[PDB]
Each structure stands twice: as structure tokens, then as C-alpha cells.
Amino acid sequence: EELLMSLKLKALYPLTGGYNRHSINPFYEELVRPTEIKGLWRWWNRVLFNTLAYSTKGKLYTYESIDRLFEDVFGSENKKSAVRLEVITDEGNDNRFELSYVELDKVIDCLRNYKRKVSLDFIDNTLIAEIEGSTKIPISFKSNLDIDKIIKDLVHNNKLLSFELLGFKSVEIDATKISDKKILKEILRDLITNYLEYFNIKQEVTFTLNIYLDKSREHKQNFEDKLKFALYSLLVFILLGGIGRKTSRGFGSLSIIDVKCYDNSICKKIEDLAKNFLKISSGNELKSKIESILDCIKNSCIDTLYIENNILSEIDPKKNVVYFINSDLFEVKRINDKEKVLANIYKAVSSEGCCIKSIITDKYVRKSFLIAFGGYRKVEFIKNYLCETCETVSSFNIVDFLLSEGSFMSDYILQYEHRNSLLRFKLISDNSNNSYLIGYILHSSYFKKIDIKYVRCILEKLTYCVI
Amino acid sequence: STQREYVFIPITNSITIDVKITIGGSDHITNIDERGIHNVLVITGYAVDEKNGRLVPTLDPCDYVKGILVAGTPQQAQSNDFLTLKLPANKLYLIRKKGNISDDLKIYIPYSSPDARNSMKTKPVSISDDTIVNNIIKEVFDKIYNITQKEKVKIEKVKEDIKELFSYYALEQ
Amino acid sequence: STQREYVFIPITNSITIDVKITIGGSDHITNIDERGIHNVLVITGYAVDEKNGRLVPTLDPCDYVKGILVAGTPQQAQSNDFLTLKLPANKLYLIRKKGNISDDLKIYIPYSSPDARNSMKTKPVSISDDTIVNNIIKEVFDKIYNITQKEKVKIEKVKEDIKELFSYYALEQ
Amino acid sequence: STQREYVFIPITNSITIDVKITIGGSDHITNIDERGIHNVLVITGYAVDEKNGRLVPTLDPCDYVKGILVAGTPQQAQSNDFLTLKLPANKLYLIRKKGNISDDLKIYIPYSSPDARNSMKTKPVSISDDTIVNNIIKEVFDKIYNITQKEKVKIEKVKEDIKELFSYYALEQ
Amino acid sequence: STQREYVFIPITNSITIDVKITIGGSDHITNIDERGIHNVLVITGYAVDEKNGRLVPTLDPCDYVKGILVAGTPQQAQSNDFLTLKLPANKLYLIRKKGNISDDLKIYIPYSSPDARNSMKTKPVSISDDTIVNNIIKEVFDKIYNITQKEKVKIEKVKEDIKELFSYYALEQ
Amino acid sequence: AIDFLVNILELIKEKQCNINLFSAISLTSIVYNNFGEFLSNNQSYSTNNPLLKYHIIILNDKNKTKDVEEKRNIFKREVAELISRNFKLDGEKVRNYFDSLKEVLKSLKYTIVDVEITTRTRALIGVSTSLGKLIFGSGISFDPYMNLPYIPASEIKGIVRSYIEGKLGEQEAEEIFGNEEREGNVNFTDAYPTRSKDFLFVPDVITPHYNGKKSEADAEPRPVIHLTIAPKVTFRFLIYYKREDVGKPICDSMPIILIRGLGARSSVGYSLFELRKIEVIKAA
């Protein structure tokens, strides 16, 4: 085993998490999880492979088949991975979260024999334990967590961060039977810690991702072109996605800083496409480079040399959903400052978001556009815009939808809580104090067939309005 | 410049004659909108001097009382014993906010001085005794709210949830 | 049709006079109701030539300027420097749309010519330094909508969201 | 350095002749590599009519028109009815960029009257009717390249890439 | 670039006159940062001396020397009989890795004669005899690092962990 | 007796590091797997058992079942945190064990190599072994009589041999580690932790979304709380042998094989170690 490559990267406002959905816990701090990098690499590899296999053959393969194919580099239950990931960072020493003291002996007395809610809130750098039963108390505390006002108002202004905070700030407490004080101290300190750790949100997180290669898995039949496709998908991932949660909304976005390689015979073109991003002049140049690298997979002097194997399996479009890149819905815009961008992305994906009530300007139509794209919505007509066989005014026709009759795609689009957002957003930079939002829309294998540049009009109206 | 007026809501029988703002000017910050009761004010840290119902300043961050908010100065022959103050009109610790604020108002508080005569013992006594929930229909909102009993059929809710909505701390001297 | 035209909003000292008819009746499309500017008509593929204030056509959709709608006429001694066009009522590009419009458009934009000798470069210019924006209200947001402070109290929301939403690019010459 | 010209690729006839110097220094921005058409440029916001169709400024960001580039002056019976401008060459939305640039190229893009008489119309349009291809690929490329029809053994590829790589919006009025 | 000085940690007085620029720059590699020593370099196949004490090449992979890694030169009187070398900053065996080294390095380890006269009979020896620890503490960590007895008071932990962290194989011949 | 059970978390937190962690977790698992029953007015009515805290809190009212399930998820996380903070490492018994064992081996005329290694990343040794398996699903290789996690000598020998036959062929290995016709010439002891920084165990999670899935229409995260070995924990083991030959291949093998994994999930950088110290005591 020896080093394959090493990618000095950088994450922008990442929201990681382990065993407690925060990036910090009483025992260690973990900003970048190599497990998440591996998983997102594999997911982007499947997306990219379906992109290629649908361009060149108009066919789509199940995820199980694709990673069964890539077993010889990514590994499975039958074979150990050949790529060993790493994540190194500054301050990789002891950096846990300690809550030295918290003065809450009073709110306890306010919670005697009362069935009452206890909400938390930062109120002008002072946190308040707002008891819903008409009470507020300025709790005091000390912690090695130095939360700056920048982070506090980043969470307050971003209407999506303030939404995923509804589950780290509030505890219902029933002391009506009886309640000791030493037990409410424990409950409230748990609440305080779950709230405080939510604000460990760093920025400019910079980490060196190493890749080691199992030499013993040398070229058996197609190891080399598989591994090369895998490195290309690693590039695609680093360029379109991010680590952590809410990467479909800009957070955790990644940015190349330096890519030193150590085996050119595997990595030459990869390092080249990487170093092309070390400095980007302006918007459309970056757009051109994104397109050049998206289609270097499809139409350059090498595209594939292994799809001619029958390990794969075609999707059953009545059963399966698969994502893939369209390589034409990739509007880019420069932003000049990143926090307000993230604060505004909520306007671009909210039903009553003032940046969408301007682009579509219709009820029951924004709703359909946001139920089809934009991840799982909570639906309370509209499906008339979501049929398979019915009036196509705005083409949001799902493959196997049928009126007043549920099928697999029907439940999946309306009631399936874990459904990524096709409309995604990326914030990149190139070490020269310039940054370009990248908006795009992955193509799902449940869209019958969409009107591409109509949705592209929508997308560019978004990326121009969302700034 | 513009004013408001906090009207107590204890269980006592002392609502009809303490003020002279039966209409306000033309509005009501606290208003019912057939969903329930909305936008009532909580003043914590101040216990109730029950007789001549007014709030005594306490240091306890845990002593709270509930009431409505309107605009005025009471009785036209008062404000020699109150606490009137002007504020950003957002330091209001309101609940059930189903309205709006003029971004700036002044508030008179019905205030009773401490009168340090002994150790104090405030007592949480949630409002009850539905004879009181009916005389706070008679004496309170049949007069303060010329909209009460004349617009909604939903008086039963604005009489039954009152048990939950309001409370106070009686010191009981 | 209802004839109109377009004005920009930079930090620039060039916003003196570019219109004769300001009302043309009692209708505008960029109406205001306690939410700041509505129906901001956005154009892209252009920049501003703020010194000699005019919109210079470059050919990159990264560049753009966002101004408002004025229903009238720019000195009628134009077309030596402007662009006129009628639209089918949704070839526009709004910000915080209010509703449907009157099927007809006529907008004149302050335009400039290339003078292509210098390698002109576009740069982002954000509305900042709310002192100059106080002057902006004093010069380009008092007389055009004088109904403000006579129908709207929210003369603060306007400067806040001008600070936030109105941004543009320039030529740096 | 030298100056380029931008030539639209529409369906119908506005294409009599638009070149005088089609040699440049050594070769043009657009090129062929027996793989496709590189350095294709697309213009947004400006549409093109089929009757004397030069790029006319519309108001929609979603309105776009494509076309390629060659270095030289158009037929020198002209140069009062286009857009002549030097852009820093990082300001053009190219398609399939092959290589480098040369620091503020100059462009010739044709211009047409805004047509302030009638409302703008627009319907998307791409190429079809293969003789359209077999005409445009020789009325220009042969007029452009000295190596076309010299190494041309990929003509089927380099036309079925035009099949999709070009599109625009015709007014059709 | 950043040329490094590997000053191994022996028990004799060979760390007095060996360097010219012991200052380096803003970054060393071996650290003392409120946790103990960091990024200590371990080498194998080499055994120090103690009379003109430097590394002599040997091929027993059980021989090994540890030391510090700081930016410097070999006194400019040597590097004619030393080991200068350039490593890609991942083929260096750093015990107690804190961060990452800077993608390439220039190391000067003292490389004495192979001693073809005698025979190699390497003998393992560690660091003890607390005064032999403290004197080289005053000689190395006080000089190279502005940290010690200026940034730290608790370097007694360093005293008690150098006597075990560092060791080597030597000859005493 | 059930009273040993409903009072076992108190025991973990008060008897910390002096309780039998194997039996402790085994008995805790009974509470964990009968949570809904141990909460129905069977908290032993004490005040320092974590079990009535799950009677103060309300997480749902439209479902007692969901109430119990969310409380149980919280309780699993809290058990992980309890074990990790309370069960610390006291490595004096291990230092004595290894010193005495090394003296025994010096008597038997072996040549001992005492190796000290340090965890750099949260390690996972024995992830399929039973410890916390009945709560977490994962486990740690735990010696219930030293009351510690340990690295088996078989695992270390297998990894060293895999490397040696990697870079010296499949024959010099069998020359050193023997085969079905010769005994090996190198002996390995288990490795035990002798000194940590703050913690010995540490909670962690793993949340497969797509592993073993067909499409996006069946994707779902399933988060797996478990325990790992904290960073900066120092293990030590011995290596003894009678011939002087095998001293050479093991020495140079030690620093190299450690920087790459020594446990589970090395592929995503978990069981990465660090040669802290090596030392060779020759006998005769």
C-alpha cells in the first residue's frame, strides 16, 4: 500500500454530526467524518455512473448493481475496499465540549409540580430559558464553547437552521407528581448541552483527505478504469456536493486547495482537472469548466471500457428512483459574501418564499414544483400537475402517477420522509476571495420526461433572485 | 408619544370602575379572532397587591401575572400612583400573538408600592371559580369589548379556555 | 398601453433628472405596502455606466442591474441614448411580485455605447453606507413615492431592504 | 490583440454574407477537432427574428441565442448596425471551451431595431430539415476554414452535433 | 524553501556548535504546545556516536534514533559530509503526528563516516540521569523554542516524558 | 434479584472502573430491553437512578408506544455516555502484570520485545465480540477479568504476518510464523491499555443510508450508536522468542504496520495507531 493522492480541501459552514447530531460532544470534536466522505463518494459515484450509462445507452442501473460492480475499489461484504480514506485537520487534539457550570437552581423552583414546557433561546448574547407557562429567566453558564455573535445571528437569520433547531431547544417537563432538584438539574443540563453544541458551527474548516490504494488489487480485469472512474467521481463530488447535513442547501460545500498526486499513471488527468479549479476568473468560466469535466466522462477520447459487463440490472421505473446529472441545468452566479446567500436560499425553496412567488407566481403550481423537486415536502388540486397521463401544462409528470389511485411512485413522492432535494445549491471558492454559487437540478428516474430549458429558465431565475 | 394601558385580570370583582377607557381610541391590541384569545400580556417579577388590584415590584424572576393590553389612562382622575413608561413596544412578553404592534407605544402600569411590613409569601393561584369566569364576562369584556357577545358565536371558548389562559400570584396579605 | 420607463438605483452622484412625467395618472407597478419595494423590474446582461450614468450592454449574464418602474417619459428628447420596447407582460423579471399586470409595456432604459478602446471590467457594487441611502431616500425615494409618510409608517423597512436587495455591477472607468 | 466577429446560426435566411477577413492570425476562436464544435458562444437576453435577424435586445434573461465566432471585419460595407466591443473574454458565456484567451478580445455581433411598434413574440427554435445543416455548414465553415473539406472525414459527426448544440428563440412575427 | 535541522537527542555534549541559522522561521515541525512534544522524527538504520556524535549508517533495522525537526542549516561548515535530502512530506515517520507537514522538506541529518576502520557493535541506551536531561533541556528547547520558560511553566511533564519518548541505539566506540 | 438490575447504572457511575464492566453491561441490557416495563412504576423510587428522569420528560402524548421508543433511544445514547465517562482507565494493574510477565519470560530465557502503541483515531477492535452487543449491536474485545478492552495476540500476529509475507514472500513468513508442519518462532501476548489521556471508551455512530439498497425509494438512515476506544489510549504487549533471527523482521515491521489499521473499519480511518516505544531485552 502507498499513497494514491491527497486533496487539501476546505468546507464552508459544515454541519457534521455523530451519535448526537452536533459536530461536538463531551468527549471529542469531529468536524469531518471520513465515514461521511466515503459514503458521499459512493453516492456521487452511483449518480455519475448512471449519468454516463444514460447518456451513452439511455439505461439506468440500480444502486446495488453499480456498487456490486465497483466492489473492487469501494469494497463490499465480499471484498475489502482498495481505497483507504483519511481525514487530517488542525486542532486534531483534545477538543471536547465542557460545560463548567450552569446556574439554573431558580428555573427548577419555577418547575415545581407544574406540567410545563421549557424552551431555550439566545436573546442578544444572553440565553433565556423561556418557560412556556409565562416565564423567562436569563440563565448564566460557562463553557469552552466560544459562540460568537456571527454564529448566533447566522442561525437566527437562516430560516432553515432555525428550523432544525426546534429539536435541540425545547423539553416538556412533568413535575406534577413530584420532582427532585438533582434530577431537573440533569434534565436541564442535557437540554443546555444539546442547545449549546448546536452552535459549534465553525467555518473555513480545512482538512487534508488522503487516499491510499491496495496494491494487491492490481488490474485484474478492469481495476484501472474502475479506479479512474472512481477518482473522477470523487472530483464530481468535491465540486458539486459537500460534507455534513443540508448540503443540498449550500452548507458543507467543498473547495479544492491543492491536490498533490503520487502515481501519475492513475491520476494524471484527475490532478489536471483538479488543478484547473485552483483559481477561477469569473462565473461562466467556472460554468465552462464544470461542463468540460461533466462531458469528459461522456465524450472524450476515453469514456468507459467496462459497461460491457452484465453484472448490472435495469431499474424498474415503477419501483425505483435513481439520480443523475443533466449537464445543462447548472446556472452559476457570484455572491461576494456567503452568509446572506445561505439565508436567502430559504427564499428559493419555500412554498411562500418571496423568491419563488416571483418566479412561478401561482398556487398549486409552486406546490407541485416543490413536491417534485426540492425534496420531501409535507403535503397537507395539485396532483393534476403531477400525473403520468394527464394535462401537461407545466411538465412535472412523474413516471407512475395515476389519479385517485396510489402506486409506488405516488406514495414515494407524497409520503416518504427521506427524499433528497433534486434542486441543490453549492458555494465554491478558489483561494482568491471570489465565490460563485452553483445551482443545479439532478435528473430523477421518476420524471417521465420534463421540458428541460423551461425548468432551466426557472433555475436561472432562482440563481439570479436568490442572491 | 402614543400610549397604552395594561388592564389587570385577577379573579377579583374590581374591573368595572378602575379606568375610563371603555372603547380605547379606535382599536384593541388584545383581540379575539374566533381561534381563541390572542395577544395578551404577561408581567413577571411583580406580584399582585390584590386590594386595589395592582402589581407590587418583587425581585423574584418567578412571580408572574396575566392581563390584557389596551390604550389609555385610567379614570381621567388618576395617574398619581402608577408606573407609566415608554418602550420599544417589543419588550412586551406577550403570548398568543395573533396581531401586530405599532413599533412604539407608552404603557401605564397599575402600580402599588412595596410597603415592607413583613416577610412575603406569594402564592400561585390559577384562576377558577366560574362565577368569576362569568363576572369577567359581565364586568370585563361586555364593556371593554363592544365586540364581545355581538359578533362571535364562540363565547364558549373565550369563557372556557380562560382557566388556562390567565393566572397570577397572590401574596394574600 | 400604459407608457412607463426605467430608472436605476446606484450609490452614484448621477441620479439628478431622467424623467418628465412621473405619475401619468394614479398607477405604478412598483407599488409599496409595508413590505418595501414590490415588483422590482430586474434586467440582466447589462451593467451601469454610473459616471455618465447609463446602462452599458455587456454580454455576460453574470452582470445585472435592478431598478424600479416609473410610469412616464424621460425628457422625450431621447432615443439618442435610450432603448424602447413593448412587452407581452411576463418577459419582465420581477422581485417580490404583487400580481398580474395590464398586458402592455413601454419602458425606456438609460443606455450607453461601447467606446471600445479600454479593456473594461465589471465589478460588483452593493448598496451600502446607509448615510448615502438616507440621501437616496432624500432624492430618489421622496418625490417619486411621496405617499410614504402619508400612507406608510414603515420608512425604515424601505432603507433596510434597499440595503439588502438592491445590488448591481459597474464598469470601473 | 485582434478582433473577432460573432455570427448567429438561425434556421432561415438572414445570412447573405458577413465576412471580409476570415483568416485572422492563424485560426479562429471556434474550431474543429474531428470531435465537435468548440468555443461556441451563446448570447442571452437578445432574440433574433427570421426577417433580417440581428440580435435584438429583449427583456427576458431566459431569452437566449447561439452562434459562433471568427476573427475579422464583416464584408466592410457595414459597421454602423452591430455591436462592436472589446470584452475581457472572461465575460462571454462560451460552450465547450477548447483552450486559452488573449486578454480583451473584440467582437462583432449584429444588432437590429428594438421594434417599439408591436409586442414581442417568442417561441423556441432549434435546427431541423437537414438541408438547413448541409447549407449552413458550407456557406460559413467552407468560407471560414481552409482545412474543412481537406481533412473532412467526420462531416456526419460534425453536423449531428449541430443537431443539438445550437438553438435560439425566433420571434416569428 | 523550509530547510530542516534534525537535531537528534543524545546524552553527550554534541549540541553546542552545530548550526548557523537555528532561528528558522514561524514554523518548526517538532512542537511543544501545552500537550508535550509533537511531530518527533524517528529514523531507523542509524546509530549515533558520542565522540563527534552523529549518525553512522548501519543495516540493523532494530537500530533507531529519535530527535527534533526544526528549520535550519548545517552550520555552513558542514553539508559537505552531512545528509541533505528532499522528501515529499509523507515519507517521514513522525511520532505523535499533530497536523500535516508542508508537502516537501529539506532535511540535514548529521551523517558521519561509515567508520570502515572499526566494526559496528551497536548498543541500546535511553535518556535518564535527570541532570543530563535538564542541561540539554536548557541547551535545545530553551534556545530553539521561545516557548519554554517563557510560554510554559508545566514543562516538568516534558522533563518526565523526554526521558522515555526519546532513545536511540549507539556504539560508544 | 431484580434489585441488582434497577440499581446497576448507579453502580456504574459510583463504582466507576472498579465494577465488572462485562457483567455490568450485560445486566444493563436487561433494563434496556425491558425499558417499557422498568418504567411502569418500577424505578425503585430512588433519586440517583437515571430511570425516573425518563418519567419527568414528556416526548409524545398521542402514543405511549412512541413515548417509550424515543425514551429508549435517548436511554441508549445515555448508556453509551455513562460507560464512556465513568469507566475510565486505571492501568496500574496492567503495568504490574506486564512487568511480572516480563520477569517470568526473562527466567524462561526468552528475548522480550515490549512494544507500546497509542491510539490515534477512535479504534474498533473486536467489533463483533460480545460487549454492549445486546444494547448497541456492536462490541469491543473485552477481557472480563482484567476488566479492560484488549487487542488479541492472534490479531496482532495475523497482521504482522500478513505484512511480513507481503514484503518477504509466502515462505519467509512460514519460516518465522511456522505452518502446519513447524511451530512458529515468535510469540505474542495480548495488548492491554496502560495509560490514556481522559477517556477509555467513547460513543460513536454509524448511519448507513444506501448500503444494500436498490434505489432512492428504499433509502433510509439507520443510526447505530456504539462504543469505540478513545484516542490517545496507549496499549502495550510483549513479543518473545528464543532464536535471534526473528528479531530482525519484527523490529522493522512494528513501526510500519501500525500506521495502517490494527482493528476494524481501518478503510475509513478508524483503528489507526502509533508506535510509541519499542525495546528489546536480549537474554543470552
Side-chain angles (χ1 to χ4, degrees), chain C residues 46 59-60 63 86 91 122, chain D residues 46 59 84 91 104 114 117:
Chain C
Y46 296 92
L59 278 311
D60 217 19
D63 304 340
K86 44 211 301 184
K91 281 192 172 317
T122 320
Chain D
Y46 303 178
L59 188 65
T84 47
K91 299 283 312 311
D104 191 39
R117 312 169 301 237

Side-chain angles (χ1 to χ4, degrees), chain A residues 281 284-285 287 453 457 460, chain D residues 61-62 64 90 93 97 124 169:
Chain A
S281 77
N284 277 125
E285 178 173 358
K287 166 71 152 314
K453 64 181 182 289
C457 179
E460 58 179 353
Chain D
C62 301
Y64 76 104
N90 308 62
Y93 178 20
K97 283 190 191 171
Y169 288 163

Side-chain angles (χ1 to χ4, degrees), chain E residues 62-80:
Chain E
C62 301
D63 312 318
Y64 65 103
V65 190
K66 323 185 194 178
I68 65 171
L69 215 48
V70 306
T73 190
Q75 205 184 346
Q76 194 37 78
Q78 273 62 244
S79 178
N80 47 8

Side-chain angles (χ1 to χ4, degrees), chain B residues 34-141:
Chain B
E34 275 138 9
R35 308 161 142 97
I37 291 85
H38 307 324
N39 197 1
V40 302
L41 183 61
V42 171
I43 306 303
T44 192
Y46 295 164
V48 170
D49 193 359
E50 264 198 17
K51 299 287 97 177
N52 182 9
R54 288 163 191 187
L55 274 65
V56 52
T58 307
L59 296 181
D60 202 9
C62 205
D63 297 336
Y64 78 88
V65 306
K66 318 216 216 165
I68 59 168
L69 182 62
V70 285
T73 299
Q75 202 251 331
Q76 183 268 330
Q78 271 198 340
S79 71
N80 59 27
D81 45 352
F82 271 29
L83 287 178
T84 182
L85 59 88
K86 182 170 67 179
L87 70 159
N90 57 51
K91 301 180 162 287
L92 296 173
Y93 175 51
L94 286 158
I95 68 173
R96 289 197 159 189
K97 319 159 70 152
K98 195 53 180 183
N100 193 2
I101 306 298
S102 73
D103 295 333
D104 277 327
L105 283 149
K106 178 162 62 53
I107 192 175
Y108 309 75
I109 313 152
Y111 159 63
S112 289
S113 296
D115 190 2
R117 265 296 309 261
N118 199 75
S119 177
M120 207 55 261
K121 193 67 62 190
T122 200
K123 279 185 188 69
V125 293
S126 165
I127 64 172
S128 180
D129 318 330
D130 270 2
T131 181
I132 278 151
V133 86
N134 209 304
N135 54 54
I136 69 189
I137 282 284
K138 299 195 291 289
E139 314 173 16
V140 179
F141 308 106

Side-chain angles (χ1 to χ4, degrees), chain A residues 93, chain E residues 29-31 33 35-42 66 92-100 157-158 160-166, chain F residues 116 118-120 195 197 232 234 259 273-277:
Chain A
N93 52 88
Chain E
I29 302 166
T30 303
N31 284 16
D33 291 328
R35 310 278 210 179
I37 320 165
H38 293 249
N39 292 258
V40 165
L41 190 89
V42 181
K66 323 185 194 178
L92 287 171
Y93 193 42
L94 261 64
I95 194 184
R96 318 222 211 178
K97 290 205 211 83
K98 193 174 204 165
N100 282 117
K157 72 197 174 53
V158 166
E160 292 321 287
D161 70 19
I162 173 172
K163 305 163 45 62
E164 39 177 25
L165 169 68
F166 292 97
Chain F
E116 294 195 354
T118 312
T119 284
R120 299 180 59 250
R195 45 167 83 89
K197 283 330 184 191
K232 308 280 170 286
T234 295
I259 67 181
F273 277 69
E274 204 179 72
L275 182 60
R276 174 187 193 263
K277 178 181 323 189

Side-chain angles (χ1 to χ4, degrees), chain E residues 71-88:
Chain E
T73 190
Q75 205 184 346
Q76 194 37 78
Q78 273 62 244
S79 178
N80 47 8
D81 56 354
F82 270 21
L83 270 188
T84 184
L85 51 88
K86 299 176 155 181
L87 266 282

Side-chain angles (χ1 to χ4, degrees), chain A residues 281-285 287-288 291-292 295 299-301 328 331 453 456-458 460-461 464, chain D residues 35 44 60-64 89-97 101 124-125 167-169:
Chain A
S281 77
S282 181
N284 277 125
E285 178 173 358
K287 166 71 152 314
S288 67
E291 281 319 317
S292 74
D295 294 359
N299 293 321
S300 290
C301 76
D328 47 350
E331 319 280 8
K453 64 181 182 289
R456 188 193 296 172
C457 179
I458 313 176
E460 58 179 353
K461 281 183 187 178
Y464 298 175
Chain D
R35 295 162 154 84
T44 179
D60 187 0
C62 301
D63 179 74
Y64 76 104
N90 308 62
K91 299 283 312 311
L92 295 171
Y93 178 20
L94 275 305
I95 304 306
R96 296 182 180 273
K97 283 190 191 171
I101 53 184
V125 52
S167 179
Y168 71 122
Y169 288 163

Side-chain angles (χ1 to χ4, degrees), chain C residues 153-171:
Chain C
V153 171
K154 284 75 178 175
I155 55 170
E156 52 276 36
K157 306 282 99 174
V158 60
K159 49 180 189 279
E160 296 177 357
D161 66 357
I162 288 158
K163 187 66 63 181
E164 86 162 328
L165 78 93
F166 279 120
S167 281
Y168 65 102
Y169 282 24
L171 272 303

